[PDB]
Ligand binder design. Structure first.
Ligand SMILES: *[C@@H]1O[C@H](CO)[C@@H](O)[C@H](O)[C@H]1NC(C)=O
Ligand SMILES: *[C@@H]1O[C@H](CO)[C@@H](O)[C@H](O)[C@H]1NC(C)=O
Lengths: 13, 177, 180
């Protein structure tokens, strides 16, 4: 069984 | 090294209430210590905190793909990971070891236990001492074990009693004066 | 009132040091981190790795994003640097100490930022650089850091120990002393 890592968005320049 | 530092922190947080019955998910963004934006599952969209997150609040909240991803995180992320980890985290139980010695202060040293939840009680001649108790409180050892030192002011039999989720019944250690 | 449990995937990126961290925290203890040098999952306890897996590659991708967000956020702040917060340092043992009975010294470094320290164990003023261990930077709810360093030892009347800590918030290195 694998832990899932949560992704994040790129920010606004 | 005098040069100024710049720190970005991200904390993807899963809070579990009543096992997995209720779950809160926070995506929290930090510049140094300054939380500037977050996604609160209970809120259901991004909110700018210290309004350096204003751009990120709008731009992220305008990407409805992202939102359904994040609105789903309490299932796809939090409840999933709880399941994976439950066996060796939520259910981890390691017994306390208990040592009593005079430091008077009579020391009850309670060591190597998991989880942190514990009750340490002093008895003098079988009666609970509710005054003169000097406690460290809970000390995290950083290796999935805890300790606590619970010291009784004394001037007979003294017994330290430990209750902990790992134990079927109280652990006692006696010191006869 | 309060939750039974919290799981936190905590990341940071620090410029100009180019230091990344990616770790999972369960109720204040580390499940794992990704070693950014070996690009590898490091389980805080070995057995966690027999119970579960994590794909280290996804963590490297998050860290790339964190550094890009950092640079964006550095400009949006007008280059507001971090204020150094110097650590509190405590040395304790794992268990009650008895002469000639194996024990472990714990150096607890707490409530500090940024997440950069140099830590040396000193036995009678001399560095101990084999058979010691340490944690990565552990997150705090106030968004400062803590860290632990460990020294297995044989208690003796003859030896003294110091945990020596350097951090940009201090004016000089801090020595925290332990002796029998
Ligand atoms: C940024 O910092 C400089 C010098 O500290 C100051 O002169 C400038 O006006 C600041 N501007 C903005 C828009 O933040
Ligand atoms: C730690 O040690 C190195 C030199 O070995 C030095 O470059 C660095 O500035 C030190 N860091 C801190 C936080 O004192």
């Amino acid at each position: 069984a694998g832990f899932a890592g949560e992704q994040g968005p790129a920010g606004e320049p | 090294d005098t040069r100024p530092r710049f720190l970005e922190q991200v904390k993807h947080e899963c809070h579990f209430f009543n096992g997995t019955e209720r779950v809160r998910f926070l995506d929290r963004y930090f510049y140094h210590q300054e939380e500037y934006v977050r996604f609160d599952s209970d809120v259901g969209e991004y909110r700018a905190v210290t309004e350096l997150g204003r751009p990120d609040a709008e731009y992220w909240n305008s990407q409805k793909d992202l939102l359904e991803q994040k609105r789903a995180a309490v299932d796809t992320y939090c409840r999933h990971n709880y399941g994976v980890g439950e066996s060796f985290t939520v259910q981890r139980r390691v017994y306390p070891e208990v040592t009593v010695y005079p430091a008077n202060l009579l020391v009850c040293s309670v060591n190597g236990f998991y989880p942190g939840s514990i009750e340490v009680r002093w008895f003098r001649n079988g009666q609970e001492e509710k005054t003169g108790v000097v406690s460290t409180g809970l000390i995290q050892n950083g290796d999935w074990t805890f300790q606590t030192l619970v010291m009784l002011e004394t001037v007979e039999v003294y017994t330290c009693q430990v209750e902990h989720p790992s134990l079927t019944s109280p652990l006692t250690v006696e010191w006869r004066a | 009132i309060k939750e039974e449990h919290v799981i936190i995937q905590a990341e940071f990126y620090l410029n100009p040091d180019q230091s990344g961290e990616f770790m999972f925290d369960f109720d204040g203890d580390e499940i794992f981190h990704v070693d950014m040098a070996k690009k590898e999952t490091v389980w805080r306890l070995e057995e966690f790795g027999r119970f579960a897996s994590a794909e280290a590659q996804g963590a490297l991708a998050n860290i790339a994003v964190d550094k890009a967000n950092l640079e964006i956020m550095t400009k949006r702040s007008n280059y507001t640097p971090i204020t150094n917060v110097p650590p509190e340092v405590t040395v304790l043992t794992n268990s009650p100490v008895e002469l000639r009975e194996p024990n472990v010294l714990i150096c607890f470094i707490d409530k500090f930022t940024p997440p950069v320290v140099n830590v040396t164990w000193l036995r009678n003023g001399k560095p101990v650089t084999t058979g010691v261990s340490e944690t990565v930077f552990l997150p705090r709810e106030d968004h400062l850091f803590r860290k632990f360093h460990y020294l297995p030892f044989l208690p003796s009347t003859e030896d003294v120990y110091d945990c020596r800590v350097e951090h940009w918030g201090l004016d000089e290195p801090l020595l925290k002393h332990w002796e029998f």
